[PDB]
Amino acid sequence: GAMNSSNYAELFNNDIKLFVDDTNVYRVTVHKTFEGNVATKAINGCIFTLNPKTGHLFLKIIHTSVWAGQKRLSQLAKWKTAEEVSALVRSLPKEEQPKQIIVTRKAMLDPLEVHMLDFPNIAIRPTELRLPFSAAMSIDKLSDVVMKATEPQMVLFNIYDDWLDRISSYTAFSRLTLLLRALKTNEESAKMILLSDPTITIKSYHLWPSFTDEQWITIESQMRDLILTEYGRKYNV
Amino acid sequence: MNTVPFTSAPIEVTIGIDQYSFNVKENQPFHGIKDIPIGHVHVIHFQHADNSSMRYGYWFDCRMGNFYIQYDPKDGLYKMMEERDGAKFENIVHNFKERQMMVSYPKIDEDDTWYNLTEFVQMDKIRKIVRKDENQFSYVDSSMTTVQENELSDPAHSLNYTVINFKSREAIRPGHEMEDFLDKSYYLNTVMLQGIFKNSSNYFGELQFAFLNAMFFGNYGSSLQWHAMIELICSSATVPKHMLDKLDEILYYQIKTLPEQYSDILLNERVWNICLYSSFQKNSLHNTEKIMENKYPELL
Numbered sequence: 001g002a003m004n005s006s007n008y009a010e011l012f013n014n015d016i017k018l019f020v021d022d023t024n025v026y027r028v029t030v031h032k033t034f035e036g037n038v039a040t041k042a043i044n045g046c047i048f049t050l051n052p053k054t055g056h057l058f059l060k061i062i063h064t065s066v067w068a069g070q071k072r073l074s075q076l077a078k079w080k081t082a083e084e085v086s087a088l089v090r091s092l093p094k095e096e097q098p099k100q101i102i103v104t105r106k107a108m109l110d111p112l113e114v115h116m117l118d119f120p121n122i123a124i125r126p127t128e129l130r131l132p133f134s135a136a137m138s139i140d141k142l143s144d145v146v147m148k149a150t151e152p153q154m155v156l157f158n159i160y161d162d163w164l165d166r167i168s169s170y171t172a173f174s175r176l177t178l179l180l181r182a183l184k185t186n187e188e189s190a191k192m193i194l195l196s197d198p199t200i201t202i203k204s205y206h207l208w209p210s211f212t213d214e215q216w217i218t219i220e221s222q223m224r225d226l227i228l229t230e231y232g233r234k235y236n237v
Numbered sequence: 238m239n240t241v242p243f244t245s246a247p248i249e250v251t252i253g254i255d256q257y258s259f260n261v262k263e264n265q266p267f268h269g270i271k272d273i274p275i276g277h278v279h280v281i282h283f284q285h286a287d288n289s290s291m292r293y294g295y296w297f298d299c300r301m302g303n304f305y306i307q308y309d310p311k312d313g314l315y316k317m318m319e320e321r322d323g324a325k326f327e328n329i330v331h332n333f334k335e336r337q338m339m340v341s342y343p344k345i346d347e348d349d350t351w352y353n354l355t356e357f358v359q360m361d362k363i364r365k366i367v368r369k370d371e372n373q374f375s376y377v378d379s380s381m382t383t384v385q386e387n388e389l390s391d392p393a394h395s396l397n398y399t400v401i402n403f404k405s406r407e408a409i410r411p412g413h414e415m416e417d418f419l420d421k422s423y424y425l426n427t428v429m430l431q432g433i434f435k436n437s438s439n440y441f442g443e444l445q446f447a448f449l450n451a452m453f454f455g456n457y458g459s460s461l462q463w464h465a466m467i468e469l470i471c472s473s474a475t476v477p478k479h480m481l482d483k484l485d486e487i488l489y490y491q492i493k494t495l496p497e498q499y500s501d502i503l504l505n506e507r508v509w510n511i512c513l514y515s516s517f518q519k520n521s522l523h524n525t526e527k528i529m530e531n532k533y534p535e536l537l
């Protein structure tokens with residue numbers, strides 16, 4: 001059923017599973033019309049579909065043209081997400097298809113369940129974890145490819161870069177969730193921590209800087225400080 | 238006006254006949270029910286004084302045979318049976334009437350309640366739903382399960398209601414996932430009405446029968462079926478106008494007749510609030526909404 005702190009090592013077992021986050025699918029700017037009314041303008045979005053064991057990220061870019069002439073876009077976005085996830089699964093060889101799909105928001109359960117009725121052996125589950133995947137658009141290279149897209153497009157990334165050569169998938173997922181929580185809590189300070197030192201660079205084929213093991217422990221500590229503080233500056237404590 | 242005589246009443250029992258009921262004491266000189274209106278199905282039901290567990294009873298139509306009740310001391314229940322000897326039956330009944338050993342079906346002349354609850358409930362529809370093809374009458378009790386319940390365990394003793402499941406391949410056309418899930422008109426009009434049920438009269442028959450088994454026997458599965466069949470219509474944007482008008486009348490009389498102190502288990506809060514206030518048909522059930530709001534405003 002629902003996924004929570006009690007069954008957390010399950011993410012890193014050998015059953016293929018994907019997280020789906022739909023928070024960046026339908027994105028808008030809200031603005032005033034010439035007549036003084038309010039209107040929305042959509043901007044490109046993305047589905048964040050992530051294998052937490054391997055780091056494989058299937059980033060389906062959602063071009064604004066998919067909304068042209070449609071009503072109830074927030075509702076449509078959930079069904080569009082489910083259609084794209086279904087299509088992704090159907091495109092995979094059987095031995096690569098997930099045994100579970102975990103949605104980060106419960107409103108995605110019925111749309112995904114309906115689109116996957118053809119796959120009765122794939123479990124569709126919610127989670128009680130508050131995962132910071134909405135911050136994926138604070139990662140510069142991901143934001144860049146989403147905003148430059150002129151058509152619907154799927155782009156593949158490893159969100160762990162080369163980390164699994166040195167750490168476990170449990171540790172990599174913890175590092176990712178820490179980084180994304182920090183970016184969600186205070187994007188500016190978070191991004192200052194990650195690039196403060198000009199000698200540490202991001203490889204052309206990576207998303208994050210090439211920190212040594214030691215530098216990562218420092219970085220991780222600085223992200224913890226940020227999250228504890230900003231929570232300070234937030235609750236006054 | 239037909240009669241269902243009883244051999245005797247050896248155990249204390251509350252006997253229901255349609256929406257009426259009366260108490261019979263152990264070994265009281267009771268020999269059945271007379272003046273039963275011809276033209277309608279009827280249900281005669283039983284609740285033992287010593288075991289309020291298990292209500293059970295029999296759906297029947299006096300036009301289809303001569304039926305009587307006889308207590309069975311081995312199986313511990315009042316059994317309905319058919320008498321094939323027509324002349325013998327007539328003679329038994331005449332003598333019991335002469336000795337005034339029968340209660341009268343106590344229908345008020347103005348009163349159309351039973352008609353309004355059974356407009357689409359005929360024996361031929363009841364027989365498709367309930368099986369003992371050797372009898373012209375059908376047994377139902379509180380614990381009998383439905384076909385859908387047995388897929389989620391004795392098959393002979395089951396209710397054949399059509400399995401309605403909104404998240405099922407039959408309900409959802411490939412490539413119309415969102416459309417068919419948010420608007421059930423395909424499911425109602427094409428899968429259920431045109432293919433399994435054939436017309437709205439068979440559909441209404443199963444809907445009314447499910448309600449009555451829920452109300453009279455506390456049959457869990459029948460309670461679910463009744464609500465599922467209401468929700469399928471209310472969640473369809475496209476429903477023939479004549480079905481909507483008839484559904485409103487059907488539900489009105491069911492809500493009017495429901496026992497007030499059973500309203501908490503027999504009525505599903507979610508289904509009724511969705512149907513009355515959110516669904517495509519939220520504005521199409523005026524009589525039903527008015528009686529619900531005046532009798533069960535707590536539920537809503």
Ligand SMILES: Cc1ccccc1CC(C)(C)N
Pocket residue numbers: 362365366397398399433434435439440442443
């Ligand atoms: C009652 C009825 C009549 C005619 C056709 C179908 C039905 C519904 C069943 C199959 C019994 N669930």
